[PDB]
Write a protein that binds this ligand. Structure first.
Ligand SMILES: O=C(O)C/C(=C/C(=O)C(=O)O)C(=O)O
Ligand SMILES: O=C(O)C/C(=C/C(=O)C(=O)O)C(=O)O
Ligand SMILES: [Zn+2]
Ligand SMILES: [Zn+2]
Lengths: 342, 342
């Protein structure tokens, strides 16, 4: 069995990328056109990947990561589409370069040129660019470009439907993912991420999207936010609302990663969420890069937790490889084509 | 041993209470005066209590509930002061009455008259009355009076120092608690609630409030939100921020109730939170009022989950009686004068 980390971002980047974004943001304020993008060097990228992800991958024993842009640096709220298209384009192009340099190790997933004041029309074009052109396999979907006030329609809205249709056309899932927090009242990677996970879940709970899009597949990170910890709570509200059971309404279409940075959380996730819904990931080099004083191992080396479970090979296969190949059909294919058959 | 339920609102009310509130908002739109507040009978109060909470207190083996006005219905987001005050008293006076009519069973916690536009001015005044006049033992403190977009100072700000000083003086904890959400893309009791618990806790980990107010005690309900589920992540972020450990910084002053509506969630909280920091709670007759198809029993019969934990009798004593009598010294006091020692 492979070991496929379904959640991981290019977080430790070359100097000149983070340059142009800041100056890019800068010519928007000064009502200026932006300057040319720096032409990065192949081996500048190689360094960052070899020094970071590729090093931990090797030490932790993984096979590939599904790899998208730094999510905290997405920042759709800055500014309008003018800043956010060339900016998403720059970030995905880099994800594309990293796949080309290390295509045995990384599979492409794109962020969207979403902006508060716009619809999904450009995001559709970027997704078709990145799937049909650059060979990506899914996308990251920001349910709140405003940056920390959840001022957007639920995912059950028809605001998003034009986008779900193309997701269905291309056969790619979305990872529901928020970005940086310009809500001064909200820590991004401690509060904001975990809140948007639950809200999105509770949103779908309130509707029935997947009656409309039966093959639409979402991933909700961080082990679904606060959802498994409160699994019984969400089951009783399905009744309170007069809704179908969770297993029927959502859990053919919603999936949870394993970025829960301690054994008891991973224990609870496996106890309460069906094996088919659980995708391995750890987003290494992210929100918690330190050792855990209590376990002598890194907080984000989650594979250590899944290997601590008492689960079968059949279950263990599903978590590390199976679910993710079924959730990402385009990656399954590419792997079958290499003779890597499940 | 004594079984005290630290989280409970008055959800099934005399009908005039509700008919009136709709008129006070009906008036307030029509720039109209409020209608006279309906005179309500002790029995119309007895009936709803006797028929609802007391019937379940009996069946469930609980000795007394810390009792405050209904959460979904505080609604500081409607609209200004001249609403929030009279509404705040009308509700808190109801609790005071319930405590009289049932003073071996209900101890009083008050809802403050917070409004989006207002500082902790009236709220400070509603705390003196309710603890000195009416004899309450603690308060509920809304971190997002705006009611849906977290547009308020963090619990670390000096804006709340005045009222924090009132709590310290009188000697009363605060349950952090948000109310009804006016935000479609977000559902009050299944999302807003959980997100507010997790934000407040992280707002605190980012700061050092208890350095200023070393006796200030909060209670974060729903089992701390996503926090114990993600506890390793929060311990990690403490190092990421160069912050003291969480017990040092927080867990002498911060506590969690046991409002986790299924066995596995209760299993975890007790695994990772210090027994000293866990307070038995249920919020019966609130968010999830039905039975659980998988157990036969109610989702919200939380005592059953504390019962099924393998934990010592001391440890059991703290959750049902010890910790909350230490967290509400005015309760601690009243019980000892009834002869009820620990
Ligand atoms: O940007 C960073 O370094 C932090 C970060 C965190 C996450 O995505 C996550 O915890 O799931 C990211 O955006 O990649
Ligand atoms: O009002 C209602 O019916 C819902 C309700 C919910 C809560 O407080 C909770 O989940 O903790 C209440 O206000 O008691
Ligand atoms: Zn992420
Ligand atoms: Zn409550």
């Amino acid at each position: 069995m492979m070991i496929i980390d379904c959640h991981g971002h290019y977080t430790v980047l070359p100097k000149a990328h983070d340059e142009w974004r800041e100056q890019q943001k800068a010519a928007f304020k000064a009502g200026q056109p932006a300057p040319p993008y720096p032409e990065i060097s192949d081996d500048e990228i190689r360094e960052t990947i070899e020094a970071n992800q590729l090093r931990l991958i090797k030490e932790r024993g993984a096979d590939m990561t599904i790899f998208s842009p730094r999510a905290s640096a997405m920042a759709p709220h800055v500014g309008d589409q003018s800043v956010a298209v060339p900016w998403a384009q720059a970030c995905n192009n880099l994800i594309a370069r990293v796949v080309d340099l290390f295509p045995e190790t990384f599979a492409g997933v794109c962020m969207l040129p979403q902006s508060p004041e716009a619809d999904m029309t450009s995001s559709i074009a970027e997704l078709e660019r990145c799937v049909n052109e650059l060979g990506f396999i899914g996308c990251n979907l920001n349910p709140d470009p405003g940056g920390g006030h959840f001022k957007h329609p639920p995912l059950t809205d028809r605001f998003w439907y034009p986008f779900y249709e193309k997701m269905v056309e291309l056969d790619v899932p979305a990872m529901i993912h928020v970005s940086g927090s310009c809500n001064p009242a909200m820590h991004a990677t401690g509060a904001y991420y975990l809140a948007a996970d639950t809200i999105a879940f509770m949103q779908l709970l309130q509707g029935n999207l997947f009656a409309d899009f039966p093959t639409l597949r979402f991933i909700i990170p961080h082990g679904g936010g606060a959802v498994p910890y409160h699994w019984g709570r969400f089951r009783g509200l399905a009744d309170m609302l007069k809704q179908p059971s969770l297993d029927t309404l959502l859990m053919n279409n919603v999936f949870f990663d394993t970025c829960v940075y301690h054994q008891p959380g991973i224990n609870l996730l496996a106890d309460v969420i069906d094996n088919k819904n659980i995708l391995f990931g750890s987003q290494m080099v992210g929100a918690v890069r330190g050792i855990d004083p209590t376990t002598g191992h890194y907080f984000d080396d989650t594979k250590r937790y899944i290997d601590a479970l008492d689960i079968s090979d059949q279950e263990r296969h599903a978590i590390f490889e199976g679910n993710t190949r079924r959730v990402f059909p385009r990656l399954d294919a590419k792997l079958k084509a290499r003779g890597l058959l499940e």
